[PDB]
Structure formats: C-alpha cells, structure tokens
Amino acid sequence: PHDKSLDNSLTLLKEGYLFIKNRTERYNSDLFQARLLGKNFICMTGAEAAKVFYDTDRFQRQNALPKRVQKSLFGVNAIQGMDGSAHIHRKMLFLSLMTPPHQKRLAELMTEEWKAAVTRWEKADEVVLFEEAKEILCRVACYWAGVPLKETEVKERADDFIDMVDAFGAVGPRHWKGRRARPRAEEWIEVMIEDARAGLLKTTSGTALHEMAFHTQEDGSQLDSRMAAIELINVLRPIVAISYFLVFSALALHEHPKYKEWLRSGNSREREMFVQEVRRYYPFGPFLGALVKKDFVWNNCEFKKGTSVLLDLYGTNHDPRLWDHPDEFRPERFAEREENLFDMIPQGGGHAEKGHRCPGEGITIEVMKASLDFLVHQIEYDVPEQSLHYSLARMPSLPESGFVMSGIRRK
Ligand code: HEM
C-alpha cells in the first residue's frame, strides 16, 4: 500500500504515536510505503514485523534516523547508530552495568530516597511527582554511577537530561532546549572522564563512570573522552527518563482504583504485573528506524536495499492479535504468560546481547516496582482537581499537570 501525501513528515508531527497505527488500520495492512523524513519509508507494525526488523542480516541502524535525533536524544555517533561486532562489543559494556545486582542496587537507593522525601512532602501544600522523580532519579543515577553531583546542580542537571528526551519528537523551542542541553551535559561529563583517566577523581571498578572511562574498543584503544561522556550520558539520561513511567504508574493507580487494594494485599507478583501493564499500556517509545541492508521479500512485499523502515512500538503493544482488549489497562492480563521477546516491545524487542534492544529494561522494571510499592504502602495522599490528560500526539507524552499530590501523609 502507498500513502501519496507530500506532508507525511508534518502529518507525523501532528499524529505522534498514532501516525503508523492510523494507517496500518486505514490500509488494513501490517505495512505501508511513504515519503517521510526526507526519504522513502516502509512503516510496519506487529510482532512478526518486529522479528523481521530485528533480523540483523537484513537491517542496519547506521544512517537510519535523522541527525536531529543524535544531536538531541542520543548524542552523535553513539551506540544507537552502530552495527556489527563493534556494536555488540560496546553493547556488552552497557549490559555489564545493568545486570540484576545493579537493578537491585538502584531500586534500593530509590527506595531510601522515597522514604526520606516523606518528611519533606508532608510539609508541602502540593508536590509534582514528575519533578520530584526527576531530581531523585538524577541524584540516584549519579551516585550509583560514581558521578559527582553537587546539591545546587541536581535541578539543572535533571532538567537538562529531560530537555534531551523531550526534544526528539518536536520542532521549534522544545527541540532547541534539547539542542542546548546536550552540549552542557557532554562537557560536564567529558571533564569528568578526563580527570578520572588521570586519577584526579576517585572512580570505582564496576561503576558506570569507571567502566565508560576505561573501556577499550575492538582495536584495543579507549573511546575519545567525548564519546565516553556521550555513552555515560546514554546511561544517566535514560534512568532519569524513568520519571515518565513513574507518573504513568501513579496515574494508573488513580484512574483504576480497584487495583490499589489488589496490590496492597498482594505481593511482588501483583506489582510486577501492574508494572508490565503500565509499560505496555501508556506511550513512551514511539517507533524505531532502520535501514534495509539487502533486497528481501517478506509478507509478499519486497524491501529494496537502502529503503528506510519504521517499526511501530506503540501499535504493536496495542495489537489485538496479542492482547485481549489491548486498549484497557488490565494488569491481570499478565498472570501466567510465557515470555516472548516480540509480543510486547515498549523498550524494543529481540535479544539485547544480539541487537539494539534496551539493556535498561531490568532497571526500569525494578525502579518502577520499588516506586509503585512506595506509593501503595508508604504514604497516603489526595489527587486534587488538575489536568491529567496525556496527548498521544506529543512525543514523549505525560499527564499535563505532571501528577499533583496534596495532603500527603505517612502510612
Ligand atoms: C525510561 C524508559 C525507557 C524507555 C521507554 C526506553 C526505550 C528504549 C528503546 C525503544 C530503545 C531502542 C531499541 C532498538 O533500537 O531496538 C532503547 C535503547 C537503549 N536504552 Fe532504553 N529505555 C528506557 C530506559 C533505560 C534505562 C533506565 C537505561 C539505563 C540504565 C537505558 C539504556 C538504553 C541504551 C544504552 C540503549 C541503546 C542500546 C543499543 O543501541 O544497543 N534505558 N531504549
């Protein structure tokens, strides 16, 4: 099927997470063609398309997405744009820092921070969960990575990281805030990388700052200080970005009260199912870009070498073929469901060690579970009249008010 509009890029800006879905539904097909972001594109959705998208002998990420994305969210020529052994090699560096022990450490640091914040929250009239989450996550990420963070800069650094994330799907001022923040963060961290290499800043083996600073490539040389800052930033920024999920989770608890008592008398199992349903239900990761390496035929369609492709993440996560009542928030849908690396992909599909799948999934899950637990057992609060609406046409999305909590009290 072929969409002939000449304003698809603009249409994409207006539809956000619904661009692809609106069309895979209008053409009654898992894929379609279109001129987007200056190139010929094939958009596809579904778990099977996902399997094809993650087949590395047919798809490469090099030169896939616009530079405007590198200059804002990811950093220029970072791991997101790599392929082959070089990608795998650096991918192992990220994974070694995101294993169960690290996931555990971070969720526990987050847990002690949430508890310490209670004393402060009780005295406040209102609290904006999104802002609280940002600063706390930033403070934890840095501490855990071994990155020095002064009390008077937590706010600024936290905001810089968010400006980066909030700039990939926009034009105008939103994109510019990210375009300026990235340079401030990379510089801040590059000096750190350099002092560590000279032993002027204490670093600890096994921590992100250290590992990024001393990592060696396939040719045996270490990354340019700047690339090491970028790659370390590709660890700190994402963690801070967990803020959006934390807000969505709290919003799910408020929008679907029945589950509150459910989790409160349940265990780690209930929290795990609620946490998964939040990652599946709400929008965060839009879609991914890849480049067709060689000509191949799939689904009776021919993919020419060089054509660009977008894999719909939001849409696949809401595919009725995989999810009964996809558009309903139902944590119980996760009770006893054999794992599958392609049916749900809010943070990518496939194998993390074999492809570009997000290596921070475990951390994302454990931090959300820890944060959910805190909101369920540790405190009591009100959700005053506010705008909780979250647009599906804005990437990333977030409840307008950022989730405001008042009359907070320890439980
Ligand atoms: C907060 C929500 C998060 C979302 C929704 C998210 C989403 C994603 C997506 C969709 C990709 C691309 C997958 C692909 O290209 O196939 C990805 C990659 C990545 N994420 Fe996540 N992520 C998040 C959190 C985290 C955390 C907390 C960390 C660090 C602890 C992290 C580190 C990374 C890295 C390094 C990559 C690049 C991997 C590669 O290219 O091989 N992420 N993530």
HSE-up of residue 197 (Cα within 13 Å, Cβ side) = 18
**Which atom of ligand 1 is found nearest the CA of 87?**
41
**Ligand 1 pocket test, candidate residues 54, 358, 366, most atoms within 8 A of CB:** 358
Task: Find the radius of gyration of the CA atoms of the chain.
Answer: 21
Distance (angstroms) between ligand 1 centre and the Cα of 345 equals: 11
Method: X-ray
Q: How many Å apart are CA 205 and CA 195, to the nearest integer?
A: 15
For ligand 1, atom 28, name the residue with the nearest CA: 360
Annotated binding site for heme: 358
HSE-up of residue 67 (Cα within 13 Å, Cβ side) = 2
* Helix-helix angle 268-281:243-255, to 10 degrees: 100
Cα dihedral 75, 76, 79, 80 sign: positive
Q: What is the CATH number of the domain that holds 145?
A: 1.10.630.10
DSSP 203: -
Distance (angstroms) between ligand 1 centre and the Cα of 360 equals: 6
What total of structural domains would you count in the chain? Answer: 1
Annotated binding site: 358
- SS3 of the chain: helix, strand, coil, percent, to 5: 55, 10, 35
Strands 404-410 and 126-128, sheet pairing: antiparallel
Query: Which structural domain, as residue segments, surrounds residue 28?
Result: 1-411
Residue keyed to tokens 């349940």? 266
Q: What number of other Cβ atoms are within 10 A of residue 358's Cβ?
A: 18
Q: How many Å apart are CA 98 and CA 235, to the nearest integer?
A: 10
Distance (angstroms) between ligand 1 centre and the Cα of 188 equals: 22
For ligand 1, atom 15, name the residue with the nearest CA: 356
Q: What are phi and psi of 359, to 5 degrees?
A: -85, -10
**Which atom of ligand 1 is found nearest the CA of 244?**
1
Question: By C-alpha distance, which of 185, 198, 183, 282 is closest to 235?
Answer: 185
Question: By C-alpha distance, which of 305, 11, 53 is closest to 21?
Answer: 11
Neighbour-count burial of 286, counting CB atoms closer than 10 A to its CB (0-12 exposed, 13-18 middle, 19+ buried): buried
Token pair of 314 as six digits: 């939001």
Contact (Cβ atoms closer than 8 angstroms) between residue 282 and residue 390: yes
Cα dihedral 296, 21, 36, 161 sign: negative
Distance (angstroms) between ligand 1 centre and the Cα of 358 equals: 4
Give the chain's end-to-end CA distance (angstroms, integer): 57
Contact (Cβ atoms closer than 8 angstroms) between residue 255 and residue 403: no
Question: By C-alpha distance, which of 358, 303, 351, 318 is closest to 51?
Answer: 351
For ligand 1, atom 27, name the residue with the nearest CA: 239
For ligand 1, atom 7, name the residue with the nearest CA: 347
Distance (angstroms) between ligand 1 centre and the Cα of 15 equals: 23
For ligand 1, atom 30, name the residue with the nearest CA: 360
Give the DSSP letter string of 282-314. S----EEEEEE-S-EEETTEEE-TT-EEEEEHH
Distance (angstroms) between ligand 1 centre and the Cα of 285 equals: 9
**Sheet with 287-292: strands ordered across:** 31-36, 39-45, 308-312, 287-292, 59-60
Q: Residue 382: beta bridge partners?
A: 406
CA distances from 52 to 39, 47, 49, 148, 297 (A): 20, 9, 5, 42, 10
Identify the residues whose C-beta falls under 6 Å from ligand 1. Answer: 79-80, 91, 94, 98, 234-235, 238-239, 241-242, 245, 284-285, 288, 346-348, 356-360, 363-364
Q: How many Å apart are CA 307 and CA 297, to the nearest integer?
A: 13
